[PDB]
Amino acid sequence: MKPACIKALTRIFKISDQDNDGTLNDAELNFFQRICFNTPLAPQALEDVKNVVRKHISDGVADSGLTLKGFLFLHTLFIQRGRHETTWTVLRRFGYDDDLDLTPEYLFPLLKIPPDCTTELNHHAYLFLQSTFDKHDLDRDCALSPDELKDLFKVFPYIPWGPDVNNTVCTNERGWITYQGFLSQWTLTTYLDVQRCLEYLGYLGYSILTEQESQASAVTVTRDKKIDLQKKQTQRNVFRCNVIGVKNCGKSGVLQALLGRNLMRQKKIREDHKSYYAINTVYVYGQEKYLLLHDISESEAEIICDVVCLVYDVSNPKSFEYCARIFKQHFMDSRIPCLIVAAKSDLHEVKQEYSISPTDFCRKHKMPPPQAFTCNTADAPSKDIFVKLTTMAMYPHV
Numbered sequence: 001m002k003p004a005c006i007k008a009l010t011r012i013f014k015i016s017d018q019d020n021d022g023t024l025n026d027a028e029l030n031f032f033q034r035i036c037f038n039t040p041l042a043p044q045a046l047e048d049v050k051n052v053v054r055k056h057i058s059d060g061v062a063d064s065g066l067t068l069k070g071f072l073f074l075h076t077l078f079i080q081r082g083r084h085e086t087t088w089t090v091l092r093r094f095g096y097d098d099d100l101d102l103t104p105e106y107l108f109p110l111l112k113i114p115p116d117c118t119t120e121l122n123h124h125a126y127l128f129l130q131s132t133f134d135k136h137d138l139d140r141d142c143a144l145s146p147d148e149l150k151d152l153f154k155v156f157p158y159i160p161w162g163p164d165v166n167n168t169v170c171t172n173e174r175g176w177i178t179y180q181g182f183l184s185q186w187t188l189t190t191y192l193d194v195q196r197c198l199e200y201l202g203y204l205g206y207s208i209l210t211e212q213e214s215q216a217s218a219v220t221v222t223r224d225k226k227i228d229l230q231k232k233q234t235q236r237n238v239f240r241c242n243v244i245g246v247k248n249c250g251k252s253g254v255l256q257a258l259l260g261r262n263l264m265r266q267k268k269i270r271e272d273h274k275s276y277y278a279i280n281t282v283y284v285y286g287q288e289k290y291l292l293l294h295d296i297s298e299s300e301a302e303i304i305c306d307v308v309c310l311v312y313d314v315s316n317p318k319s320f321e322y323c324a325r326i327f328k329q330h331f332m333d334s335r336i337p338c339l340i341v342a343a344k345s346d347l348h349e350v351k352q353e354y355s356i357s358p359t360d361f362c363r364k365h366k367m368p369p370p371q372a373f374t375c376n377t378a379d380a381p382s383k384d385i386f387v388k389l390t391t392m393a394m395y396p397h398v
């Protein structure tokens with residue numbers, strides 16, 4: 001029949017196939033019937049349907065589970081008809097309108113975020129994404145190969161992730177998005193563009209599979225930053241840090257260090273797949289938090305953060321002046337914590353040409369001492385600065 005209807009039903013099947021085995025078993029079938037038609041068929045009434053399929057087509061029932069061809073056959077057996085309410089009942093249940101398109105109410109639910117508030121995923125939202133990952137990790141490598149990513153995006157109308165995502169979150173030795181990196185990308189997406197995240201949850205059928213009113217049920221909205229500073233206490237799990245410094249001072253090296261990549265692996269990164277964001281889990285005093293690094297290129301929007309990482313290059317006499325300049329310019333009379341990082345510590349330190357030395361600058365403006373850092377290590381770079389950067393974002397008042 002009409003290709004648009006078949007494409008919609010095909011996607012619905014995929015969403016309904018929660019174990020991604022290519023068939024709908026009795027457990028998945030009953031769930032489907034319950035959300036579409038209130039009540040599932042009796043165990044024998046189900047094998048009656050399966051028999052009807054078996055007598056017409058041979059590839060409609062496999063492991064005593066309904067295949068896509070059998071699913072389409074049913075709706076086709078359902079399409080001779082009069083019968084047309086039952087297919088449309090399924091279509092409407094999965095957010096489609098009369099033109100076989102996902103409704104705006106389904107894809108873009110209303111979610112107002114007050115100023116200076118951030119968006120995170122609740123515990124149940126994460127558990128859904130964890131299930132989503134395992135569903136498509138059919139090789140159990142705890143990573144999504146390009147083929148498995150392609151499989152995951154088959155419910156998407158477009159490819160949601162570019163090749164720069166692999167340079168934004170944790171990947172394995174061959175550049176494949178890790179289970180933890182998968183969660184990080186979703187964490188990153190919810191924080192920066194919650195509207196985009198909700199839309200992606202719609203394509204995955206979050207509200208349907210988890211039986212909630214809207215995709216917005218997955219999002220937790222943190223309280224006002226002003227209150228966090230007043231109470232001197234926050235409940236946020238995700239903190240953003242702006243990385244600021246002159247060109248070629250090693251900012252990109254810092255972001256990639258958070259992902260556990262040393263300098264030479266970073267030299268394997270294609271320039272067209274470069275990312276100006278990096279996010280990974282960080283432990284602070286036994287607490288697991290998310291650190292969100294944003295590489296600010298040297299050029300109110302790009303200053304909003306929970307902590308500032310002022311990076312300078314020790315092999316560059318001109319570099320530290322920028323950190324001083326920007327600090328005085330925007331962060332001197334601010335309650336946002338600042339940390340100075342002496343990047344490229346592996347290189348020979350050159351005398352900085354600023355009027356005051358980096359060390360005394362920190363003590364005068366009552367900042368922590370300049371933090372030595374290098375992403376040029378034999379193994380993975382140290383995550384010390386990231387723990388410290390996160391600790392300061394959690395406790396600015398210290």
Ligand SMILES: Nc1nc2c(ncn2[C@@H]2O[C@H](COP(=O)(O)OP(=O)(O)O)[C@@H](O)[C@H]2O)c(=O)[nH]1
Nearest residue numbers: 247248249250251252253344346347374375376
């Ligand atoms: N020796 C050494 N070189 C580094 C380090 N980090 C970056 N570099 C080099 O500095 C150059 C620019 O680094 P990059 O991070 O891209 O600078 P950015 O413009 O601030 O992002 C690159 O060619 C790197 O090879 C480091 O920790 N040690």
Ligand SMILES: [Cl-]
Nearest residue numbers: 246247297298
């Ligand atoms: Cl730059």
Ligand SMILES: [Mg+2]
Nearest residue numbers: 017023024025
């Ligand atoms: Mg199945």
Ligand SMILES: [Mg+2]
Nearest residue numbers: 137143144145
């Ligand atoms: Mg895999």
